Design an enzyme around this catalytic site. Structure first.
Site, PDB file in Angstrom:
ATOM      1  N   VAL A   1      -7.369 -47.001  41.261  1.00  0.00           N
ATOM      2  CA  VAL A   1      -6.206 -46.155  41.531  1.00  0.00           C
ATOM      3  C   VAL A   1      -5.117 -46.986  41.673  1.00  0.00           C
ATOM      4  O   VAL A   1      -5.010 -48.275  42.294  1.00  0.00           O
ATOM      5  CB  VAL A   1      -6.436 -45.589  43.029  1.00  0.00           C
ATOM      6  CG1 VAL A   1      -5.595 -44.525  43.228  1.00  0.00           C
ATOM      7  CG2 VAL A   1      -7.814 -45.166  43.049  1.00  0.00           C
TER       8      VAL A   1
ATOM      9  N   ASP B   1     -19.742 -35.461  50.598  1.00  0.00           N
ATOM     10  CA  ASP B   1     -19.396 -37.134  51.023  1.00  0.00           C
ATOM     11  C   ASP B   1     -17.932 -37.151  51.733  1.00  0.00           C
ATOM     12  O   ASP B   1     -17.105 -37.887  51.588  1.00  0.00           O
ATOM     13  CB  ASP B   1     -19.443 -37.826  49.402  1.00  0.00           C
ATOM     14  CG  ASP B   1     -19.041 -39.311  49.741  1.00  0.00           C
ATOM     15  OD1 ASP B   1     -19.586 -39.791  50.654  1.00  0.00           O
ATOM     16  OD2 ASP B   1     -18.450 -39.712  48.666  1.00  0.00           O
TER      17      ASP B   1
ATOM     18  N   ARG C   1     -13.581 -42.725  55.093  1.00  0.00           N
ATOM     19  CA  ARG C   1     -13.187 -43.511  54.078  1.00  0.00           C
ATOM     20  C   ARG C   1     -12.675 -42.836  53.063  1.00  0.00           C
ATOM     21  O   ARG C   1     -11.830 -43.278  51.941  1.00  0.00           O
ATOM     22  CB  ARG C   1     -14.451 -44.533  53.387  1.00  0.00           C
ATOM     23  CG  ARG C   1     -14.767 -45.809  54.451  1.00  0.00           C
ATOM     24  CD  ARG C   1     -15.641 -46.629  53.398  1.00  0.00           C
ATOM     25  NE  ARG C   1     -16.487 -47.363  54.324  1.00  0.00           N
ATOM     26  CZ  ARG C   1     -17.623 -46.852  54.779  1.00  0.00           C
ATOM     27  NH1 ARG C   1     -17.797 -45.690  54.559  1.00  0.00           N
ATOM     28  NH2 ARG C   1     -18.525 -47.588  55.474  1.00  0.00           N
ATOM     29  N   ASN C   2     -12.990 -41.580  52.843  1.00  0.00           N
ATOM     30  CA  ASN C   2     -12.841 -40.469  51.869  1.00  0.00           C
ATOM     31  C   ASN C   2     -11.700 -39.604  52.223  1.00  0.00           C
ATOM     32  O   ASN C   2     -11.594 -38.493  51.526  1.00  0.00           O
ATOM     33  CB  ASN C   2     -14.049 -39.692  51.267  1.00  0.00           C
ATOM     34  CG  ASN C   2     -14.969 -40.791  50.559  1.00  0.00           C
ATOM     35  OD1 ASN C   2     -14.649 -41.848  49.889  1.00  0.00           O
ATOM     36  ND2 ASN C   2     -16.268 -40.408  50.535  1.00  0.00           N
TER      37      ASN C   2
ATOM     38  N   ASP D   1     -11.894 -37.802  47.031  1.00  0.00           N
ATOM     39  CA  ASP D   1     -13.134 -38.076  46.348  1.00  0.00           C
ATOM     40  C   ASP D   1     -14.142 -36.674  46.069  1.00  0.00           C
ATOM     41  O   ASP D   1     -14.879 -36.394  46.956  1.00  0.00           O
ATOM     42  CB  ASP D   1     -14.066 -39.255  46.858  1.00  0.00           C
ATOM     43  CG  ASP D   1     -15.453 -39.214  46.236  1.00  0.00           C
ATOM     44  OD1 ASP D   1     -15.348 -39.705  44.961  1.00  0.00           O
ATOM     45  OD2 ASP D   1     -16.422 -39.029  46.508  1.00  0.00           O
TER      46      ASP D   1
HETATM   47  C1  9WX Z   1     -13.849 -44.790  43.055  1.00  0.00           C
HETATM   48  C2  9WX Z   1     -13.314 -45.996  44.003  1.00  0.00           C
HETATM   49  O1  9WX Z   1     -12.203 -46.293  43.965  1.00  0.00           O
HETATM   50  C3  9WX Z   1     -11.840 -45.927  45.315  1.00  0.00           C
HETATM   51  O2  9WX Z   1     -11.924 -46.833  46.178  1.00  0.00           O
HETATM   52  C4  9WX Z   1     -11.153 -44.607  45.627  1.00  0.00           C
HETATM   53  N1  9WX Z   1     -10.327 -44.518  46.746  1.00  0.00           N
HETATM   54  C5  9WX Z   1      -9.986 -43.477  47.660  1.00  0.00           C
HETATM   55  N2  9WX Z   1      -9.121 -44.057  48.596  1.00  0.00           N
HETATM   56  C6  9WX Z   1      -8.497 -45.098  47.896  1.00  0.00           C
HETATM   57  S1  9WX Z   1      -7.191 -45.978  48.466  1.00  0.00           S
HETATM   58  O3  9WX Z   1      -7.459 -46.766  49.839  1.00  0.00           O
HETATM   59  O4  9WX Z   1      -7.099 -47.381  47.495  1.00  0.00           O
HETATM   60  N3  9WX Z   1      -5.613 -45.151  48.400  1.00  0.00           N
HETATM   61  C7  9WX Z   1      -4.760 -45.892  49.104  1.00  0.00           C
HETATM   62  C8  9WX Z   1      -3.482 -45.133  48.904  1.00  0.00           C
HETATM   63  C9  9WX Z   1      -3.907 -44.164  48.257  1.00  0.00           C
HETATM   64  N4  9WX Z   1      -2.981 -42.988  47.702  1.00  0.00           N
HETATM   65  C10 9WX Z   1      -3.608 -42.096  46.874  1.00  0.00           C
HETATM   66  C11 9WX Z   1      -4.861 -42.307  46.267  1.00  0.00           C
HETATM   67  C12 9WX Z   1      -5.661 -41.316  45.671  1.00  0.00           C
HETATM   68  C13 9WX Z   1      -6.975 -41.557  45.261  1.00  0.00           C
HETATM   69  C14 9WX Z   1      -7.550 -40.491  44.567  1.00  0.00           C
HETATM   70  C15 9WX Z   1      -7.576 -40.540  43.084  1.00  0.00           C
HETATM   71  C16 9WX Z   1      -8.224 -39.361  42.474  1.00  0.00           C
HETATM   72  O5  9WX Z   1      -8.217 -39.178  41.107  1.00  0.00           O
HETATM   73  C17 9WX Z   1      -9.263 -38.409  40.529  1.00  0.00           C
HETATM   74  C18 9WX Z   1      -8.287 -37.995  43.368  1.00  0.00           C
HETATM   75  C19 9WX Z   1      -8.471 -38.141  44.641  1.00  0.00           C
HETATM   76  O6  9WX Z   1      -8.639 -37.075  45.560  1.00  0.00           O
HETATM   77  C20 9WX Z   1      -9.957 -36.110  45.028  1.00  0.00           C
HETATM   78  C21 9WX Z   1      -8.054 -39.191  45.519  1.00  0.00           C
HETATM   79  N5  9WX Z   1      -5.751 -43.173  46.900  1.00  0.00           N
HETATM   80  C22 9WX Z   1      -5.025 -44.283  47.673  1.00  0.00           C
HETATM   81  C23 9WX Z   1      -9.364 -45.401  46.906  1.00  0.00           C
END
Ligand code: 9WX
Ligand code: 9WX
Lengths: 285, 298
Positions: free
Chosen positions: B29, B160, B164-165, B178
């Protein structure tokens, strides 16, 4: 709940947990001192590594850890693989005890010894790199002689001990023979075309992955197909595109990588053939 | 190759990539400025988040990103979920554009706003000027209950639901995120699980764990654990108890004790969530009723 195996079982009271070495995302590895894990000298304590489950572990992660443990028992002992020392399986959380590798994964090891900060007194010579490759070929030749496939051969999954011995690690995806799940969990830039398209995996698929690992090594921890995204890789491999020669790499070694990256698995060398060729080159260096 | 969908498609030249927000286990992301993504004001640029594949991505990660994108289209818009803004699908790598949440995931958000001395408070990350009040925590819960009530009204299960989500925007709006494991159970009355599911065990309801079924009432249980997480300011459930040793304990009727930073009423709400008979648990509708009531009295 988990069945008993007295051969491997280690008493919990003698194990002493320590600092986390790293969290892989589906698992957790911590340093630990273990008293009398070496049966020949029961009084002495030795630094080991202990894999266990995360707090946010899933149902699938518990069977994968047990599967991996079972794989490690039947693979047997080799110098160039991370070896099982013992386990705590009974009446508590599952601790799988394996060899400790103090210098970390090969990617960071190589980046740290490129001629930000983090750079030590000891930098990588040509003979050193060739000796990394040959050590890993021996490890992989052994695995192949045990009719076992790795399926996740990457620099990040190779560990380095205190005495700079290369050890192949993570037997998570490892299998004995393979017909893939149609949706295998294998990293795409290290994957052979058959594994990618045809849902098959042989030892010759590991050879391809070894091809990429060599490139990784002679770029001192570079990342493959630089600039090229996964979506755009499928079509390039079908057109016959391959990675260019690393600068700190002879014409001979590059041709070995390119032999590894034949699209027809039989035209690739075997691990036996790589061990032959690498020893030859290691001697001449 | 990826099919056309003109409704959602966004031109690549207007998107401007920026700093990586996270490296997850099987996702990437990054922050980005996107010009005219909001059709109603075409000239203005907005800070978005773009999910895309890692360099070390797997075969499965490509279909999961597309699946998740498709889930997000049919779920529809709500204030308390991360919403789809657009996509770059054509003639390039897949960029899925979603709302930006500047204050990160709720677990780190809460740990960062713990009082000094606590297990997870770091001087460099800590915001004690935005320290978490009781009304603040109740308002987190209620916002998340609304999000989950919406998802349930769309006959969708999350599976889920963890701190964290959950993401937090600039205006401290809680957004559920997520939708990887999310499933539609509109026609099928419940979901039939596979053997060895990829769901976190400490958040999983007994039915999901043992009987390979999942209903909205399984999400309620997960919400039960999320509440505990919230009122421990990012604590991790069943502390000290390993996953191996949890299966037997849940069957014997073991549940988590009351967090200290938590009233008797809210604890009873968690325990209502952790009933063994999914129908005797509250519905998300019932949680939204009860939480608004409590939020008003504070
Ligand atoms: C799958 C592994 O990548 C991750 O760690 C997913 N993730 C969940 N939260 C984060 S984050 O802490 O790095 N984060 C910090 C600020 C921030 N702002 C926006 C997002 C959006 C993540 C996201 C992408 C997304 O794209 C498909 C769909 C979503 O919700 C269903 C959420 N994520 C943000 C990352
Ligand atoms: C399963 C994830 O861990 C790995 O096998 C791959 N890995 C990649 N980087 C690391 S590490 O940076 O966290 N690491 C750093 C020092 C270090 N020393 C020892 C180990 C052993 C990890 C391990 C655990 C293990 O538990 C079952 C089996 C193994 O070989 C198959 C290897 N890992 C160490 C570990």
């Amino acid at each position: 709940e988990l069945p008993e195996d007295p051969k491997w079982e280690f008493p919990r009271d003698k194990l002493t947990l320590g600092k986390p070495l790293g969290e892989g995302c589906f698992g957790q590895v911590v340093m630990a001192e273990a008293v009398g894990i070496d049966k020949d000298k029961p009084k002495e304590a030795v630094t080991v590594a202990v894999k266990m489950l995360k707090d946010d572990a899933t149902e699938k992660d518990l069977s994968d850890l047990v599967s991996e443990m079972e794989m490690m028992k039947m693979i047997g002992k080799h110098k160039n693989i991370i070896n099982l020392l013992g386990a705590c399986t009974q009446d508590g959380p599952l601790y799988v005890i394996v060899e400790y590798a103090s210098k970390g994964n090969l990617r960071e090891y190589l980046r740290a010894r490129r001629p930000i900060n983090r750079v030590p007194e000891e930098q990588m010579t040509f003979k050193d790199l060739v000796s990394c490759t040959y050590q890993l070929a021996r490890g992989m030749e052994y695995l192949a002689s045990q009719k076992c496939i790795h399926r996740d051969l990457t620099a990040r999954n190779v560990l380095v001990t205190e005495n700079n011995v290369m050890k192949i690690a993570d037997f998570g995806l490892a299998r004995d023979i393979y017909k893939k799940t149609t949706n295998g969990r294998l990293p795409v830039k290290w994957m052979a075309p058959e594994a990618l398209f045809d849902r098959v995996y042989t030892h010759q698929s590991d050879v391809w992955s070894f091809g990429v690992l060599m490139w990784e090594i002679f770029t001192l921890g570079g990342s493959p197909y630089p600039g090229i995204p996964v979506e755009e890789l499928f079509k390039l491999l079908k057109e016959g595109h391959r990675m260019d020669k690393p600068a700190n790499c002879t014409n001979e070694l590059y041709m070995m990588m390119r032999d590894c990256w034949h699209a027809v698995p039989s035209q690739r060398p075997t691990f036996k053939q790589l061990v032959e060729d690498l020893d030859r080159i290691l001697t001449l260096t």
